[PDB]
């Protein structure tokens, strides 16, 4: 089997991407944030504290004839940006782009943090990292991809995120018309539960490529590109007037600037992020100071190839016995 679904930016800045997902019988369609950096499929629901729901579409398990409460199971997640959510668990039928999994764990939120409430466009998350990170207790549950994998034509999914435009998540096949050149594959460590890999280096604009190992994670659920302080300083030094602002929380730059591209290495291959992808717009409405899309990972503990990087590529998440990651230009 295969599936294919369009993913759409939630706003004009590509702050996140939502993909429609059918849950239950009859289907309840929710727009979920597909997140290769986590492993829980959780949704706003009829059980969510009312004051914490503000415009989201909710899953109502009592209206699904295939929903079953997973007795005694709870979940609770804290994401790296400080947001969090928790609740109980159902199993139900879940379909993405024509690919159906029966008995998928659907984690129904009883509580969500303010950042989730304040984003009316995201109805929940669909985790695509390794199932070892799933938070359901006392019996850990499998991700949608892990449940589907044996039925898929090939045990893979691909992320093709658009810049200011829709894109595609495919399951079970590689669309060879969706990229240029070849896909370069690179080794993955699953020891931390992530799609963790090592980039071979970087360049800023038309500058010389610096060969250096950068260990990080491929994370569709993180907006920005978080890299070591030395790398980030080298990038922003090429933008007149850019500076790291402790009050704002990162590098900012004059909105009138033209940003240079940023290239990252995948083996001998090179993925070029156009400068415009690095502009996240005014720091507050009406400001002429803009937020940068490349930020320091200091204090995260890991480098993160978020949407800024991934949307410059066609990305293969290969879930074979030994997982690998593939990148192509597009
Ligand atoms: C839950 C994880 N997928 C999130 O990963 C992180 C963690 C931190 Cl501390 C910061 C950022 Cl931007 C991302
Ligand atoms: C009707 C078209 N052939 C559809 O092609 C596209 C074009 C963009 Cl920009 C994004 C996506 Cl998801 C699909």
From Swiss-Prot:
Disulfide links within the chain: 255-290
Keywords, alphabetical: Aspartyl protease, Disulfide bond, Hydrolase, Protease, Signal, Zymogen
GO biological process, one term: proteolysis
GO molecular function: aspartic-type endopeptidase activity
Span of domain Peptidase A1: 17-328
Residues annotated as catalytic: 35, 199
Catalytic reaction list: Hydrolysis of proteins with specificity similar to that of pepsin A, prefers hydrophobic residues at P1 and P1', but does not cleave 14-Ala-|-Leu-15 in the B chain of insulin or Z-Glu-Tyr. Clots milk
Superkingdom, natural source: Eukaryota
Enzyme Commission number: 3.4.23.22
Enzyme class at the top of the EC tree: hydrolase
Family: Belongs to the peptidase A1 family.
Protein name: Endothiapepsin
Higher taxonomy: Eukaryota, Fungi, Dikarya, Ascomycota, Pezizomycotina
């Amino acid at each position: 089997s295969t599936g294919s679904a369009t993913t759409t930016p939630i706003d004009s800045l590509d702050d996140a991407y939502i993909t429609p997902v059918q849950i239950g019988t009859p289907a309840q369609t929710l727009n979920l944030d597909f997140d290769t950096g986590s492993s829980d499929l959780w949704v706003f629901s009829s059980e969510t504290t009312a004051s914490e729901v503000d415009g989201q579409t909710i899953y109502t398990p009592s209206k699904s004839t295939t929903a079953k409460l997973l007795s005694g199971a709870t979940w609770s997640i804290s994401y790296g940006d400080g947001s969090s959510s928790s609740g109980d668990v159902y199993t139900d039928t879940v379909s993405v782009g024509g690919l159906t999994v029966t008995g998928q764990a659907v984690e129904s939120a009883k509580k969500v943090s303010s950042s989730f409430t304040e984003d009316s466009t995201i109805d929940g998350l669909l985790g695509l990292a390794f199932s070892t990170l799933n938070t359901v207790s006392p019996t850990q549950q499998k991700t949608f991809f892990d449940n589907a994998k044996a039925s898929l034509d090939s045990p893979v999914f691909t992320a093709d995120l658009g810049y200011h435009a829709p894109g595609t998540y495919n399951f079970g096949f590689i669309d060879t018309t969706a990229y240029t050149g070849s896909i370069t594959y690179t080794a993955v460590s699953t020891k931390q539960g992530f799609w963790e890999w090592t980039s071979t280096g970087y360049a800023v604009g038309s500058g010389t490529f610096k060969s250096t190992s950068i260990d990080g994670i491929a994370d569709t659920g993180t907006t920005l590109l978080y890299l070591p302080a030395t790398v980030v300083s080298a990038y922003w030094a090429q933008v007149s007037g850019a500076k790291s602002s402790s009050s704002v929380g990162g590098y900012v730059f004059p909105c009138s600037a033209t940003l240079p591209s940023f290239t990252f290495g995948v083996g001998s291959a090179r993925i070029v992020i156009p400068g415009d992808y690095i502009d996240f717009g005014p720091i507050s409405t009406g400001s002429s100071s803009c937020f940068g899309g490349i930020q320091s990972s200091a204090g995260i503990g890991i480098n993160i190839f978020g949407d800024v990087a991934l949307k410059a590529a066609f990305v293969v998440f290969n879930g074979a016995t030994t997982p690998t990651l593939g990148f192509a230009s597009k």
